[PDB]
Amino acid sequence: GSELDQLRQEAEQLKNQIRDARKACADATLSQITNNIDPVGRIQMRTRRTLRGHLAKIYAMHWGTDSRLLVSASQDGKLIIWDSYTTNKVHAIPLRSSWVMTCAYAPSGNYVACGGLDNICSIYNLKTREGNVRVSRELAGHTGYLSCCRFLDDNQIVTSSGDTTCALWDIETGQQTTTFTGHTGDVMSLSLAPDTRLFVSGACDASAKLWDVREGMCRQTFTGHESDINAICFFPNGNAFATGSDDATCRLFDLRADQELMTYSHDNIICGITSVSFSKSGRLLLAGYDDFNCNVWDALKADRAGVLAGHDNRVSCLGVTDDGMAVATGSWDSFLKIWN
Amino acid sequence: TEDQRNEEKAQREANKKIEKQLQKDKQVYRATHRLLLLGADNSGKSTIVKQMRILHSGGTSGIFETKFQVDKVNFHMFDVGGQRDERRKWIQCFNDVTAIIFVVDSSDYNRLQEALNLFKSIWNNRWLRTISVILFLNKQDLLAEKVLAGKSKIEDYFPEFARYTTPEDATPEPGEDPRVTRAKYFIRDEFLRISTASGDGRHYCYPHFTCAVDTENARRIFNDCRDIIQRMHLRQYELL
């Protein structure tokens, strides 16, 4: 008891030291510095395509590196690879388990990953000599549902799970190379840095952490939000990121400053955020909401700039092309629209 | 010129074949009804699943899938078992099932309030409105013997039971003692009060008393799903 009390007291002292350092590091705010910048309040765009064919609600999607082909996942048990320009279907992969929750597109273009409520990550081959798409590897070892996955290259992939940990795999041998064991609640999202040397993750406990891929331990923690974090995305230059939470706000964090420095909220907005994404330059911030809309924020002024209406149900996923030419959004109404 | 030829070939072959396969898949998909099984460790939901699997699983990774068929209509039930305590995130993958099966153990009063709270939390979720619930009270035999023995009294956990009076619509079984019926209907009325307090016309709850020897549960689920689908059709076809 006495030792436990001493440990708790010294933890409180370290917390106070960190808070004092954070307070000292703050001498201004984004609002004051950016007050002179002109706004972009003339943002308005309309849907240019509508992809049909999925039987049930869409849970995830991911662009290809060429920004022409994209893969989508639906809870009826299908992975469909569309051609964006002509709206043609290229492939259609049936899945063993229909409760898929995530999907990824290999940067090389040869594979697609999949996973969900089965605690497995399946790798599919799109360029087999026989001219068919077949399973080539299954990754097992997580004790909770799979929430996200991302390819590093043809051989390794990093995943997050509902068991509060993240892992790094080697596809050829299907073995866990590293494990990350910092969070306290479910991990809901991932995001890789442009150089693939770090990544961030947000959990059900209202905090986010930064990881070192090779070293294997956490380096920072951010505790600004009030409820579960549902989405996370790195900034183009790789020195900041943004999160979406169930408390109906978004916030932008600062790796170097270790501090939160912006909030995006409105009085009449009461629902939560489901997805976020940055534009090519980082001046815009797109977020999907539990209400069937999608709001375009001003990442520097923090005032709204537009809206994307037209879905008849909850907006679930969101993505932007590598060349910043189009935005794709899926929804629980089972349609996948392309805007602008 | 070769680009036009390639585009024509890709369009024709790929899109036509894929669309035909998708239509074939949709035909099968629309002809099956899927159900979610919920319960606690001391309940007997797995027992019922096994019973109708015998009466009428592969790829089990914590999820026990079961199939059965009544009057040539196909059903598919799922039982998530590979997850830990917290439920509030993976529960919304089931926002478009026909019904949710909720099983309770009514012979143990010390765990009754936990089931009451879980039912109340499910009934009021943002994404689980519009989904009906089938309610099974699973251990009527144990409850009957427990009440007959008289070792423990219900009023300690629920003091309101002292002033309870049996409802008129109650239809006791031929050989039932009045006080066992009183207790069981009281426990049922608790759940029904939570259900009717703040529900709506887009929501319903069907209760049934069940045991570990019953073999009518498949037909109960069938009839309740028929009622649910008819009520949805009334609204779809602009009669409501």
């Epitope: 409820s227 408390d247 | 529960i91 499910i122 979720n125």
Partner: nanobody, 128 residues
Framework: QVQLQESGGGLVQPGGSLRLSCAAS????????MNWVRQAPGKGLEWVSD????????SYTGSVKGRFTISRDNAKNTLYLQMNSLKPEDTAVYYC?????????????????????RGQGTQVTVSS
């Protein structure tokens, strides 16, 4: 940084009285609803009482009905539990809990193990 700190408690004779206080910081107190949860020796977490945002819609577990009372103070971000007529079966740690989402009337995982938005607890012992 969500944190909740409990106070009060100690040794009390059967039929005694105590007042538990729970100070909250780091969130809007009035948007969420609050609960009381206790863990007796050799037992799991157990739900006791809850109170809605405004102050109406109170609820209790039956074993403590007519004995304990719950209330809010939205101006001070504090929660209370006036205990009286204590019995030996009330010896346990008492945690201060709150729901995961603000504008909701469902509270899913408040009684789980390793739930994040819960307090450290305070020991209440009743004996002679």
């Amino acid at each position: 940084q969500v944190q909740l700190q409990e106070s009060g408690g100690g040794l009390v004779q059967p039929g005694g009285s105590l007042r538990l206080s729970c100070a909250a910081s780091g969130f809007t107190f009035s948007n969420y609803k609050m609960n009381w949860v206790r863990q007796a020796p050799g037992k799991g977490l157990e739900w006791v009482s809850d109170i809605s945002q405004s102050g109406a819609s109170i609820s209790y577990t039956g074993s403590v009905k007519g004995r304990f009372t719950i209330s809010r103070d939205n101006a001070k971000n504090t929660l209370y539990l006036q205990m009286n007529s204590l019995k030996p079966e009330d010896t346990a740690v008492y945690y201060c809990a709150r729901c995961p989402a603000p504008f909701t009337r469902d509270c899913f995982d408040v009684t789980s193990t390793t739930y994040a938005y819960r307090g450290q607890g305070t020991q209440v012992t009743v004996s002679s």
